[PDB]
Design an enzyme around this catalytic site. Sequence first.
Site, PDB file in Angstrom:
ATOM      1  N   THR A 142       1.640   3.356   5.432  1.00  0.00           N
ATOM      2  CA  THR A 142       2.080   1.992   5.693  1.00  0.00           C
ATOM      3  C   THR A 142       1.767   1.097   4.491  1.00  0.00           C
ATOM      4  O   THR A 142       1.017   1.466   3.581  1.00  0.00           O
ATOM      5  CB  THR A 142       1.392   1.396   6.931  1.00  0.00           C
ATOM      6  OG1 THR A 142      -0.024   1.518   6.779  1.00  0.00           O
ATOM      7  CG2 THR A 142       1.822   2.097   8.222  1.00  0.00           C
ATOM      8  N   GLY A 143       2.361  -0.096   4.498  1.00  0.00           N
ATOM      9  CA  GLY A 143       2.005  -1.140   3.559  1.00  0.00           C
ATOM     10  C   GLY A 143       2.588  -2.466   3.997  1.00  0.00           C
ATOM     11  O   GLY A 143       3.729  -2.504   4.461  1.00  0.00           O
ATOM     12  N   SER A 161       0.794  -1.223   0.000  1.00  0.00           N
ATOM     13  CA  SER A 161       0.000   0.000   0.000  1.00  0.00           C
ATOM     14  C   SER A 161       0.830   1.278   0.000  1.00  0.00           C
ATOM     15  O   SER A 161       0.249   2.353  -0.181  1.00  0.00           O
ATOM     16  CB  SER A 161      -0.945   0.021   1.206  1.00  0.00           C
ATOM     17  OG  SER A 161      -2.209  -0.501   0.836  1.00  0.00           O
TER      18      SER A 161
END
Lengths: 240, 245
Positions: B176-177, B28
Site C-alpha cells: 500500500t501507499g 510507500s
Amino acid sequence: QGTCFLAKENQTVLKREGNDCDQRYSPASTFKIALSLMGFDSGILKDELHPEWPYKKEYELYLNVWKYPQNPHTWIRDSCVWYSQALTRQLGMKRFKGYVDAFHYGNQDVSGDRGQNNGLTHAWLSSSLSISPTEQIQFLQKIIYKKLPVSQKAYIMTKNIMYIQELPGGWKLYGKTGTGFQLKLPLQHGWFVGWIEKDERVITFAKHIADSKENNTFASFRAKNDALIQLFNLINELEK
Amino acid sequence: GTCFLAKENQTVLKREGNDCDQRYSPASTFKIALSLMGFDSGILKDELHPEWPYKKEYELYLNVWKYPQNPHTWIRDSCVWYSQALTRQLGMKRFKGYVDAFHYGNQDVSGDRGQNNGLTHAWLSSSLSISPTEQIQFLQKIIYKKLPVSQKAYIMTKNIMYIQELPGGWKLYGKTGTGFQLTKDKSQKLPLQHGWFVGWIEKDERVITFAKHIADSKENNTFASFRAKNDALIQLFNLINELEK
C-alpha cells in the site's frame, strides 16, 4: 443494523465498540474453528494437508474454488462448506453434540432447521446455533489457553490452518470469516474473529456487522476489512 | 477517480475506472523499487539484514517504527525512516541511475520544490509520479526479470513483499501507499488523500500483476491505503473466481 468489535488480552477488555456485543448470531463459517478442533481431536483430520477429499455434485457449488480437492489447509483458506459437512457426517450427531457442549459454544443448539432433521450438517448455517461476539471471545480464549478437552495435535493443527498474515509490529494474525443471513432480499451479517500474537502476548478479537439492506459484497469481507483497521489502530496504541 | 488494473503475462484481464493513466506520487509503493535497489547494490543483504536502530531524529508516525528495523519489518511496518536511511546510503548517483533505468513514472527525483531533498523525499507526495498503467509496467518488469538487477535482488524483493495466501492458493505480494494530492506546481499539499495497493498474485506458473488507486475529492474519515487495499482484495477474490472456472 448494529456492529461489535471486541478485543481482549487475557482477562483485560482492551476495546469494546458498537451496540451488538452481546447479541447472538449464527456463526456461519466461523464455526469451522470449532469443527477443526473436533476433526483433529477425533482423528478424522490428520494434518494440514491430510485428508484430501474430492468434490461431489459440482452443480451446487457457488464458488469455483470449491470445485477442487480439499484438505484442512484449503478448507479454511477457501471456506469450503462441503468439506465441513463431510466432516460432521463422519463424526455423527452424538460426537458432534458432545463437542459442542464440551466447548460450551454459544447457545449449544445443534437441532438445525424445523422439518429438515439437518442439524448435523446445517446447525451453523443461519440456523439453530447462535453465538454472541462476547461468546466468540470466550471460546477463542479457551483455545488460546488450551482449556478444552482436546489433544495437543488438535490445538497445534487448528492454529496452523487458521494462520493468515503478519501485521505491523510482528503481530501474527489467526482467524476466520463467516457470512450468514438474517431471517424479499438477502440481508447479510458478517463475522471476522480470531487473535493476534506477539512474543508471549495474545489478543483475542471478534468483529460482527449486521446489514439493514442488501449489499454489493459479502458481509464477512467487510467485517474483516473493518476489523483489520481497528487492529492496526489497537497495535499502534499498544506499542506506544 | 479510481483505477483497477490486472494483467496476466500480456493479457489485461481487468481495467476499471477512469484514472488509470493519471500520474500520482507512489508514496510507500515506491518501497518495491527501493527494495530492488537495496539488494542489487548490496546495501541490503537478506530478509533480516541489515538491522538498523531507530533514532529520535526520525519521525514516529507509527509507534511500531520505534523498534529496530530490517528489510522484512521495513515492508511489514511500512517504515519510512528505513527507506530514507537506505537512500542516504545509496546516494543520488546510484538512486537516479536506478530510477532512470527502471523507467519509473516521470523519473523526477528533484524532491520538494525549493528544498534539495529528492534523495529522501522524492517519492513522498513530491516530485516523483507514476500512473496505475505505469505501475503495472514496472511490476511486469520484476515478474519477467526485465530490470538491470541481480537474481538475488528479485528473489529477496519477492520474499519481503509476501503478504498471505488467498483462496484457490493464489499467493499475494504487494504494498500500500498513501499520499496527498498537490497544488498545480507542487508547492503545497492539499488535504486530499490518494491511496494505492499494487503487487501481484501467483499460483503455479501463473502471475497476475495488479494496481489499485483511489483519489479522493474531499477529506475522508479512513486512511486511503486501507480503502484501496480493502477494495482491491474484494476485486482480486472476484477475479480469482473467474480464473478458477
